[PDB]
Design a protein around this ligand. Structure first.
Ligand code: PLP
Ligand code: PLP
Ligand code: MG
Ligand code: MG
Lengths: 386, 386
């Protein structure tokens, strides 16, 4: 049937201004198809566990077991005997008191914020913190106060003005790969009587003792109120989790709308995560190699005069406007380097990022090639870098 | 660390008013543990497919295959070669032009509404429509105009007053099991130049030719703009889908925040759905049996004086306030009948429901037993039904 004018107008306008403008007629994030020979730096699977035979075996085994039909809200599954062992193990892993499974990192953040916020609750959020955190705050009708990226001085002034609130940060930032000043943030939380929420999606598994994370690495675990993470990065699974050093996870399952009104992870999924955790705990070798390759790439690109703000395995090439970003993308892909285009609504219109996500399967030769491709891009490329 | 007052006060109040007041000290939804002999009416797996040997085998096999590391946004996977066969099959199944997979039914609704709504778009939503639709409208900053349940007069008045917009309904309602007046809603949409969105979460698989849904059953497919569904009901899988009789699914992947910022389903998950679809297509006998059992139950309960608004496999026992609901729940569970308590925020505080979700494994003896238990419950004097 015919669409009403206001919907048709929106779709017509969108296709013109987001698909039709680009050379290939597709959205800016969609370039050319990658060949087997190309270097792919797009996946969040940092320790290259997507195809791990032990994970696949345990997941298949658990699925083939007699399946109880648990197609329902997790609200109904909160009796002690119905809660999955993975929660207790992830809590022990990170050093937090309690863990609660969620269907996504997005839902973990939205759910936690809905539970701990009242309307007009002060939420002090890093300008570059994940969209799920910004949205979580917005859905709860909290008062969001952005602070300049990693700027503790700016943060202090905001809390001085508005009073006690929730300080919200990524441990490692999704677009830039910068690291939050977690120690200073803990100090500030104490200095002003705030709660701290740290999203460790990009540090859990890759950082800390046995991959326990950045809070564990810095010995700050017992001074942080909340941590969250997508399990779709290093844990290579479509899920999320909320950790609390308090009783909040007793309440989340009955308060969070995504936790109430969206279906639970099935029991076999929880079992697969148990194996993933064991593999991650022992993956000292992969973590070290990733760390070394990441440092090499950061040093190599910084030498070219490129702005590389990263301190991690996530490297952000800052490519300015969309037209320029299309050029940089086309050049890199033409020379066998496939990153991820980060544009609006993930960034502002004129501050786009081509994100290179490193994983432990990337070797010295590939690292050298990336620097080589970027060097030719700086010197011979008909485009700029911010 | 101890929580600051602004959180602690909320949590304290919540525990007091939602956990402490109940006899067992737990949330209202949490009763006693069921025995293997008990009648369990809690799962949305209407055709009892959770333990189907063929589905399990297809998933495990596709899981054990060589997996590509696709842990990223689905926006990066919108090339024709990256889009799954299940989407084309599901579109043919329902008779809709195009289908787009989502991570949940919740995400399907939230994403679609974000794509087709502008700020202040009129959204005419049934009082009892699923929370995901209410929230999808709220996130999009749409103007919600709630209409009395299944009340086309109230809807007509609202659209005359506020103008063209989007009419949003469940085909079969999640708490009451009532059926939307879909033919009349199609007429109203045409008369007033509105778009119609129908959530078929509770009719897809159970109703229509080969389980194609209620729109298909009524021959209304080609007159409806959008249909959505959780695949976590009859399809017994943690996913959702958006169907369009237009070009909107071209745009959803790049606009919807869950589609953009949350990880996609993996290829093996899609293959599992293909097998599930085939089984559902041929499950005529299961559909027929469920339909017969559900009618038998509604007849049996309604003659006892209970209000039973249902016309489907979802049967809502209307139990009034929370104190009454607790007593009803306890009686039913003590006598071997386990439904799901639906209370706030899913219902009003004084209009709680104990939902009986029937499935095709339920037999005549069990239906007779439920009727017997409720017959004795009516005469017991400890509580009431509405
Ligand atoms: C009518 C209706 N729509 C959407 C959903 C969302 O389903 P899902 O569990 O796949 O998120 C459900 C609730 O779970 C539902 O009952
Ligand atoms: C920092 C951060 N937090 C949370 C999420 C949400 O992850 P998920 O894909 O599991 O919804 C992501 C985005 O993918 C992320 O990068
Ligand atoms: Mg990310
Ligand atoms: Mg439901």
């Amino acid at each position: 049937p015919q669409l009403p004018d206001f919907i048709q107008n929106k779709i017509d306008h969108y296709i013109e201004n987001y698909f039709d403008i680009n050379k290939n007629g597709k959205h800016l994030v969609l370039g050319k198809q990658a060949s087997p020979d190309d270097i792919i730096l797009q996946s969040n699977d940092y320790l290259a566990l997507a195809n791990h035979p032990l994970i696949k075996a345990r997941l298949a085994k658990s699925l083939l077991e007699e399946q109880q039909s648990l197609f329902m809200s997790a609200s109904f599954l909160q009796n002690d005997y119905d809660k999955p062992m993975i929660e207790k193990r992830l809590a022990k892993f990170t050093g937090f008191d309690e863990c609660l499974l969620s269907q996504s990192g997005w839902n973990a953040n939205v759910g936690l914020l809905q539970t701990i916020c009242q309307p007009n609750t002060n939420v002090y959020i890093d300008f570059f913190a994940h969209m799920s955190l910004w949205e979580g705050a917005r859905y709860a009708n909290a008062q969001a106060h952005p602070f300049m990226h990693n700027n503790c001085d700016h943060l202090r002034m905001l809390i001085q003005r508005h009073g006690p609130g929730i300080i919200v940060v990524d441990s490692i930032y999704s677009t830039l790969g910068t690291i939050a000043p977690l120690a200073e943030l803990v100090n500030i939380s104490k200095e002003f009587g705030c709660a701290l929420l740290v999203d460790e999606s990009h540090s859990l598994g890759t950082h800390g003792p046995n991959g326990a994370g950045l809070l564990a690495e810095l010995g700050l675990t017992r001074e942080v109120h909340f941590m969250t993470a997508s399990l779709a990065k290093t844990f290579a699974y479509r899920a999320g989790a909320i950790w609390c050093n308090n009783e909040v996870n007793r309440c989340v399952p009955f308060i969070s709308y995504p936790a109430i009104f969206s279906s639970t992870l099935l029991p076999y999924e929880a079992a697969g995560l148990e194996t993933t955790l064991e593999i991650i705990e022992s993956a000292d070798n992969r973590r070290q190699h990733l760390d070394r390759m990441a440092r090499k790439l950061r040093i190599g690109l910084s030498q070219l005069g490129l702005t590389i703000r990263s301190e991690s395995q996530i490297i952000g090439l800052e490519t300015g406007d969309e037209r320029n970003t299309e050029k940089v993308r086309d050049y890199l892909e033409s020379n066998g380097v496939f990153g991820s285009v980060f544009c609006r609504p993930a960034t502002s219109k004129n501050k786009n990022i081509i994100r290179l996500s490193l994983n432990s399967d990337v070797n010295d030769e590939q690292i050298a090639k990336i620097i080589e491709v970027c060097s030719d891009a700086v010197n011979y490329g008909d485009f700029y870098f911010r």
